[PDB]
């Protein structure tokens, strides 16, 4: 069936009294390989063994949560894995691709330059995972919805927070929610100032390229969206929203304190228009008889000194 595993939708009681509006977490951190990516990533690389069998090699370096679960996935599924990583890669996130038994190498000065590698590394049987843009990844990703349905017991939210990066996971809400007849259920997406791709293709309406930008939201730095994406926002109520660093910054502190989790700032990005109160501001009718659900997406990119470096920076 699937590699990812469902996952709590924790209640956050301290902020529905804050934003008199009742405020759900979906707790992807839970996912095995440690963010949402499980999902997406999932879905491809089981398709993927199903298709072309086990003397495949998966090939990536599309960003950190993507190389872990890829990593996770070629050890479930018998397959080799060759995954590239920054230079300076947090040295867990080596251990855990090392300890799946892929082959691991050290280039490039950021995951763009790793992914760039990695890329031409593929050969004659190698498949490249990519981390937002592929039809099986949406449909992976999907499944968060289907599980929503049941958690709210077919009660559609005010809204659904979705972090934004390639917009994988993005249209995977969207698809999901016209799947489970929930086409007016909006859903917030946010990016980060420092890489908002989403944000500017929606304002242009054709595909925005960005390049050498950077931000402590490492999961959500895209060169563009997905053309899907820019699709889907004109058939579905999508909000395009963006925060700064120090924002998605003080909301991975809020809710290391709240709910004891550790978690990287690109879903900070989604929890900060929970801490902010900016979700008011988006959504002027709020009550207690209404439902926000916030997509926590987990990630491994963060870290005690990471917390120690946002504290001094932000804050
Ligand atoms: C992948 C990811 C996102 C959203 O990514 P898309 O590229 O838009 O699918 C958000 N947060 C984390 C931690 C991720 O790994």
């Given at each position: 069936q699937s590699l990812h595993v469902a996952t709590p939708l924790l209640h956050a009681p301290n902020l529905t009294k804050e934003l008199e509006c009742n405020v759900f977490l979906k707790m992807e951190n839970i996912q095995p390989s440690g963010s949402v990516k499980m999902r997406g990533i999932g879905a491809f690389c089981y398709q993927a063994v199903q298709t072309r069998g086990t003397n495949i090699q998966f090939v990536c370096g599309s960003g950190p949560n993507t190389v872990l679960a890829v990593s996770y996935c070629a050890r479930q599924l018998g397959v080799e894995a060759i995954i590239v990583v920054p230079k300076a890669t947090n040295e867990r996130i080596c251990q855990s691709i090392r300890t799946d038994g892929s082959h691991l190498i050290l280039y490039g000065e950021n995951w763009t330059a790793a992914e760039v590698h990695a890329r031409k590394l593929?050969?004659?049987?190698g498949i490249y995972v990519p981390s937002s843009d592929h039809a099986l990844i949406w449909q992976g990703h999907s499944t968060i919805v289907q599980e929503l349905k049941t958690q709210l017991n077919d009660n559609p939210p005010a809204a659904i927070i979705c972090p934004v990066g390639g917009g994988g996971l993005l249209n995977g809400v969207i698809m999901g929610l016209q799947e489970a007849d929930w086409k007016d259920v909006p859903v917030i997406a946010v990016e980060t100032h420092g890489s908002n791709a989403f944000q500017a293709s929606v304002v242009a309406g054709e595909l925005v390229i960005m390049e050498k930008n950077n931000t402590i939201?490492?999961?959500?730095?895209?060169?563009a969206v997905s053309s899907k994406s820019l699709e889907l926002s004109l058939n579905h109520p999508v909000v395009p929203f963006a925060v700064s660093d120090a924002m998605a910054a003080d909301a991975v502190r809020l809710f290391a304190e709240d709910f004891k989790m550790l978690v990287e700032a690109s879903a900070g990005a989604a929890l900060s228009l929970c801490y902010t109160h900016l979700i008011r501001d988006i959504?002027?009718?709020?009550?207690?008889?209404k439902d926000v659900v916030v997509?926590?997406?987990?990630?491994?990119?963060?870290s005690l000194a990471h917390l120690d470096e946002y504290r001094k920076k932000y804050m």
């Amino acid at each position: 069936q699937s590699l990812h595993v469902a996952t709590p939708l924790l209640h956050a009681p301290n902020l529905t009294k804050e934003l008199e509006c009742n405020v759900f977490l979906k707790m992807e951190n839970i996912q095995p390989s440690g963010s949402v990516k499980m999902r997406g990533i999932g879905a491809f690389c089981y398709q993927a063994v199903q298709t072309r069998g086990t003397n495949i090699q998966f090939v990536c370096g599309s960003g950190p949560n993507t190389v872990l679960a890829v990593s996770y996935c070629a050890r479930q599924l018998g397959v080799e894995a060759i995954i590239v990583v920054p230079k300076a890669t947090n040295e867990r996130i080596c251990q855990s691709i090392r300890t799946d038994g892929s082959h691991l190498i050290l280039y490039g000065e950021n995951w763009t330059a790793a992914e760039v590698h990695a890329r031409k590394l593929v050969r004659r049987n190698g498949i490249y995972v990519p981390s937002s843009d592929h039809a099986l990844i949406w449909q992976g990703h999907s499944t968060i919805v289907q599980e929503l349905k049941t958690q709210l017991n077919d009660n559609p939210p005010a809204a659904i927070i979705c972090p934004v990066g390639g917009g994988g996971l993005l249209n995977g809400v969207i698809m999901g929610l016209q799947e489970a007849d929930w086409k007016d259920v909006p859903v917030i997406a946010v990016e980060t100032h420092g890489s908002n791709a989403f944000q500017a293709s929606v304002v242009a309406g054709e595909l925005v390229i960005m390049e050498k930008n950077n931000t402590i939201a490492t999961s959500l730095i895209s060169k563009a969206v997905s053309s899907k994406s820019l699709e889907l926002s004109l058939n579905h109520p999508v909000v395009p929203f963006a925060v700064s660093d120090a924002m998605a910054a003080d909301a991975v502190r809020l809710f290391a304190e709240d709910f004891k989790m550790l978690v990287e700032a690109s879903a900070g990005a989604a929890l900060s228009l929970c801490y902010t109160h900016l979700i008011r501001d988006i959504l002027p009718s709020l009550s207690p008889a209404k439902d926000v659900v916030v997509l926590v997406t987990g990630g491994s990119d963060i870290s005690l000194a990471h917390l120690d470096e946002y504290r001094k920076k932000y804050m």
